[PDB]
Symmetry: D2
Subunit: 501 residues, 4 copies
């Protein structure tokens, strides 16, 4: 099943890309990369050092100052970003396969990511030359005032394992479109598609040092990427505790930060929702990508009048979800990403039971022989819980949902907002007026009305509260990579003569 | 001279303003406030505790959630902000006097601040109802996509002693215009105008808890203001080390931060500049507000061909600068702000000499009997220095300039950018083309061509590098107080049927 | 009424109150009783020519055009405060001149205050753009400048309101203007010009021409020094104005009213729909731009709806706008009332039914005024002239529809495209309908609202351009692309 | 030239290549030698009527108008790539039809590629706005919709370039269009329509009408189903078009050329100014929209400047646009050349001096073509018809000025307002001048540049509206304010 993807690795680079060259780690260290479907070592790549990271940041600064890219016309930068987009489409099949091999998600999930990635690059390619800044009506006579937008500078970018190429395209596109130099480091356990995308960008051609790729989770590599004085912006997508640590580091040089740290996304279902649609979308929110996608709906809030019927209907569908190899077209859910992540998920099951919650279905590794070698976990539904519980307040980022009941509209909103997170959520009801009222009160970066999962390049994505700082995608996403400069010219300068002559 | 201002204090409140009430500190502690012209204790105000700060933040959260202000129409919020602006103008004389009394700057400097403050409020009042968000052309058929702008939420705001009411208006105006609730804490040594502005805002009328005022530098008050979980944005203007500490704290709850930490602002003078203008503006950049204003030009870069002549002409003017009471119309420069700040300035003079720099004039406290009781420091020019020196790389924020020579345009730019700062700077030359080239290469939030000092509400202000994060003033400043929410409605929802039925 | 003893009677040209160049005057009438209440100057085309040339001179001097946007904003705001300050008197004068109820005039005054305040705050918010030039070593900018000299012609229904929509952005942007209100309703406009002089503007920046003199209209639309002609009024006059503006390739902005549909589905809040159908049809005797004369109601509830509407129409209280009990005043003039009567003759000839009203009220206290009964025409169809043509009177037609699709097809079957409503508790549907209607403004479960924050204007024959909002400000600006080559090199295309 | 054996000869209406309804045709000429090179259909007003009704039907079906903006963008991009792909052939065909040098045609092709690519990227970037409503419990939005059906008339100087300026935004926004190129220069337009069919659009979304048939122009400007008429060409035709559009209150966008000043101060880079004065006057034989026929030079260097310019003008190499040595081709047609000759007769009658040129070249190889010598007219003034009127030919006038102020006053003394330049090493001054010029585009130390990223169009009689940039996109959109009352309450104004 996976052997065609295994073939691709025969030609994939194993090294870092620093300052126009594929290089090993300064100490020759390496890391084994695994396929989560069978836990087999499938590739070995360089494990970079903090000096490698250092050298990349300084190369990115040197290229920035040269102006080769930063002072290129916006139109031409747009054409190059478009050329990356065209590469993604041209190598769509291989890229989708490489992503399924590395992360375990189904091939159709990977193809959908490859479509999004193409559109992300294409969107930024188009936006690149559309806004150079503003002319201001100066309140001072005989002055000309303008705001010019410049690339922010050297940017470090840390991407997560869920999921590599898609989140990388969110950061890379705007950075290249605006003229920044970047240093990217993907998750130590999933570097395959990122290494491939760097090979393709190298084919498109960028001046030396504009793009650099650091691999691994080496000692203090993160520190250097978040704390180096030549960095102007650190953009991190991943876990909350690392995110916080990254921000503390960025403070040492008063460096701009952008964070996206996941969330406990609510899926609110009223008793006047289209029922079968809500059940369908509750499965999709809970179990696409094994519940590991950023948009996952792990917190179901359902109105008390239909709660029992919704629970039975959901549980009945969950038992039919097909687990298996992501390359097998019959598979509906692949495995979770690592031993460590599967272990955290298991332990949250113990906490659930101990707290009084009911594991209504799932909650364990599956039996079947073809899944035994893999990092599989059964899709899980947890009932009879409430907001005071750890399993409701803490995000597990696995194929697991909790179900809480609510009596009124006001209670739904209150419960949905009762979390430290604020990334995304949905409201299901045929009463659109009501759904709009709810949407307006939810503290969430994105709200879906009668849908679940949609994100796209045209609109910004990001969190309120502990889910993040800043936005990716849209004009706002482009803005994270820009800095504003006010240039004021006194066209008729006269002596002030404040001080005695 | 100062007795009319002393009269105003007879009716000024001495307390904090928390949740619609003027209150003492929870432990009844107080702090003596000084006039830097004579070091006399002129007022005693409450010294708040961390619990006071806590209570204000929670009151601000409660008011935010009630919607009284946050859900008010933008137009009406604009009218109230306009009403504050009108108060400032109506009480312009008293406010200017109170500011000269507290900070020591000349009365004309204070009147100019009062004009700026009126225009800041008036600008935000006008901008308040001009942008509600965007409609997006959704890439998904039968979806409606919109971005709605909401107030960011609870905001804490820490203002500096240089200078109180002006920097406070930069933060307050956009916060009220967008519908946020705020908690402000001015510098412990200059709370007078801030207390007055709160009395005036109370007259305009805001729902209980929308605005709160905390006084002092109490134990952990800053920590609570920067680290409390109910805060959505911390905005701090002040010293670099406190700024960094504030950001590290804000990270504990992944809270948005906005910082403005001063700079080492360059004033580049070419040999084809209008000479007398450049000398005049070099004095203004170096010595307005005793060199303590955010826009101060402490780093003069002058072309080698006119360096000796520029130095003599500058030194000759510096000896004529009139020091004195800020209420005496003859005064051209008042005192520095505190014993501590004057001490730091003295010690930088020792470091200058030890490093080999020449104190060409000034560098000490003045003799005169009418200045003896005050915190006066002579306007100072430091020659024969270079970029490698601490006195050139570190900002003193006093009435002191350094003079370095440069041979070429390329050297001017290089030297000007050779600092950890990036707030503001100027270029003087009759060759406008050249001045534009230089302006485009300087890493600075604001660049003046043939001028020095101008900031205004219509344009954003803030720093590159260690001078800050974010912007104040302009549409950008308003944006710091807003959060974006993507609402996506599927107008024709259909079952996805990904999972087996 | 005492107000009139202090009000000027002259034109305002180049900083001076002046009579007509031939001393001609015109009598102004109170439609409530047809009494002459004031006499004002009736300008000549030479007066109009003189104001245009003055506006142009002031514009060129730069005193207003080169003033800082912030300061222009502060003066527009001072005008707004003067409106609020003189709110009562202004309301009374509008009611005297136009006949609408005192309450209608108060609401106008509140709107006018907000219109001026909106543009005052917008004045200094956009100077243009910096462009990222595709040519290396070039700087590219777009500067927004005031469009220049602007002529403004306002209608009689909301004289002061429509005036503020034009005056506010013109002043905010730095243009010089020449305004001419409806010849039958100049009072509040004269008064607002007094208020403006109190604020103080450079000579020629604002000018007021009065009347309907011979070729005054033509000079305002066809003079070569005009950069923009802004007209709100009748479609025939509008077309003529645009043809004239064409002689100098002059920018035009037109608002020509419309045949505005009121769509009522059977799942609408029934009582609400009846209430809003009345409001749509009869606020200001149906002479307001946002009036909903074309009612479309779903067949399932058509009979119930017609009966309820008609029963309510019979209770509408006609009377003096100054009396607290009046719910609808008289129509504006003899000619307009005659037009409304002609339109009733067309309805009859086409075979429609006058379910109620259709004539002048009989009552004694109403005898002397220009009153017309609120009227409902039933049993008509889209092919009839009374459905296709707008009368701008206290009259509504009622047609039925079977489906959503049929309601859209009928509502879009007219030459107009200004505004309309959809009433339905199914918000999903109301939105589908609103996205398909060719109207500048669509209301979902409401009727009439307009405000400074959002643009207003028509698709199709209801206009060209927009007023209010940022788009409204933009009619008064022009873009200039200044491109600077920072490293100019010889091209050497032609042999040396 | 071989290219022509494969090129269509018909119109393109409602997804089909069709002849004229009366089978009439017209002969197309190569201005280099006046040979008939192709024969195409000559449409009737009925054909035009049919395309409009087809564009309207397709627009209403929603196949293109309701397609996602992102997908519309991708198809506009595929058109752009087809331009680059067929760059050589297209350049050769433009040169064949218009006579300009192969190098001029290549630059056009590069520009056209960038125009399409710009709008392709702009398509999905702005859907409208959310408004913060001043009314509580209301949601207010402004949705931007395609304007509808658009008629587009392009000129003969840059047929394909001017076509791309109109086609690109129309397609990007979702409009349906009907285009009619200049009757004497249809070749590249026909070819671009073939390219578009290869990309594939819904039937009726694009339509091509050919010729100058009787009342074809009038139907394109006056038909009631048109929402926007976009015309680039002569000022008289433009005015007539606007008067016609007025009959249905139709939006107009006009670009009518101009009398573009080239201002040369005595502190300009002298050699640069001479070089750019030549370029401004004689690129495309001075028939391009951005041509600088009116030279204003400071008196201090006027004599030196005139002599240098004239000496260079004598060396300009006229010839076949396909030969690498040619620097200027022939003028477009017999009529236009005759107009240029008439204008030389006016210069003489007014007493001006033909310093050089002013007639047809005498040489053998040029005998058969529509050649006109590059010409310089000296000793003229602003009061003369030759200074005030534009000929769009290879001719420039030279006038002197004493001061900055006098240069501004002279440059603005014309009925036009399209583009101009200022040359001076004193950038401060050049900027003062540029801010005072009433021109849509001002170049500082350059001449000619225009690009997709910035708007282009005229003040005064040079146009209404703008093309290129965001403002260009906006002519093809219309705003709709949808206001939703989320808590509707009865008003109860009328007694229950
Ligand atoms: Na892996
Ligand atoms: Na946050
Ligand atoms: Na003090
Ligand atoms: Na920074
Ligand atoms: Na009516
Ligand atoms: Na129209
Ligand atoms: Na010409
Ligand atoms: Na015009």
């Amino acid at each position: 099943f996976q052997s065609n993807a295994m073939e691709l690795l025969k030609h994939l680079s194993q090294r870092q890309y620093i300052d126009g060259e594929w290089v090993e780690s300064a100490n020759k260290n390496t890391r084994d990369i695994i396929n989560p479907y069978n836990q087999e070592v499938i590739f070995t790549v360089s494990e970079g050092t903090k000096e490698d990271a250092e050298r990349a940041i300084l190369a990115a600064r040197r290229a920035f100052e040269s102006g080769e890219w930063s002072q290129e016309t916006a139109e031409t930068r747009g054409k190059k970003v478009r050329a990356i987009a065209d590469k993604i489409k041209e190598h769509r099949e291989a890229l989708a396969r490489l992503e399924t091999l590395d992360t375990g998600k189904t091939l159709e999930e990977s193809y959908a990511d490859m479509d999004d990635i193409h559109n992300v690059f294409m969107y930024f390619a188009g936006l690149a030359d559309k806004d150079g800044g503003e002319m201001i009506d100066s309140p001072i006579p005989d002055t000309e005032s303008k705001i010019v937008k410049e690339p922010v500078g050297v940017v470090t970018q840390i991407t997560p394992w869920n999921y590599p190429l898609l989140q990388a395209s969110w950061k890379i596109a705007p950075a290249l479109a605006t003229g920044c130099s970047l240093v990217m480091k993907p998750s130590e356990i999933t570097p395959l598609t990122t290494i491939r995308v760097f090979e393709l960008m190298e084919e498109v051609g960028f001046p030396k040092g504009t793009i650099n790729l650091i691999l691994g989770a080496g000692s203090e590599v993160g520190d250097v990427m978040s704390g180096h004085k030549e960095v102007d912006l650190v953009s991190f997508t991943g876990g909350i505790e690392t995110g916080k640590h990254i921000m503390k580091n960025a403070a040492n040089n008063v460096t701009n930060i952008a964070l996206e740290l996941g969330g406990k996304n609510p899926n609110i279902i009223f008793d006047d929702a289209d029922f079968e649609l809500a059940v369908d979308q509750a499965l999709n929110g809970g179990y696409f990508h094994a519940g590991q996608v950023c948009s996952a709906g792990s917190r179901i809030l359902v109105q008390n009048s239909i709660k029992d019927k919704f629970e039975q209907a959901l549980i009945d569908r969950v038992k039919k979800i097909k687990l298996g190899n992501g390359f097998d077209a019959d598979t509906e859910m692949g495995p979770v990403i690592s031993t460590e992540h599967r272990n955290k998920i298991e332990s949250y099951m113990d906490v659930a039971k101990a707290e009084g919650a009911t594991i209504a279905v799932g909650g364990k590794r599956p039996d079947r022989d073809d899944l035994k070698d893999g990092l599989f976990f059964e899709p899980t539904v947890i009932t009879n819980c409430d907001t005071s519980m750890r399993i409701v307040q803490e995000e597990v980022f696995g194929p697991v949902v909790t179900v809480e009941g609510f009596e009124t509209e006001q209670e739904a909103i209150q419960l949905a907002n009762d979390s430290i997170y604020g990334l995304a959520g949905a409201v299901f009801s045929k009463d659109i007026g009501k759904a709009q009222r709810v949407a307006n009160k939810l503290k969430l970066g994105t709200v879906w009305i009668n849908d679940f999962h949609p994100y796209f390049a045209q609109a910004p994505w990001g969190g309120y509260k502990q889910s993040g700082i800043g936005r990716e995608l849209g004009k706002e996403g482009l803005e994270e990579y820009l800095v504003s400069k006010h240039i004021l010219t006194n066209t008729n300068p006269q002596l002030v003569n404040w001080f005695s002559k």
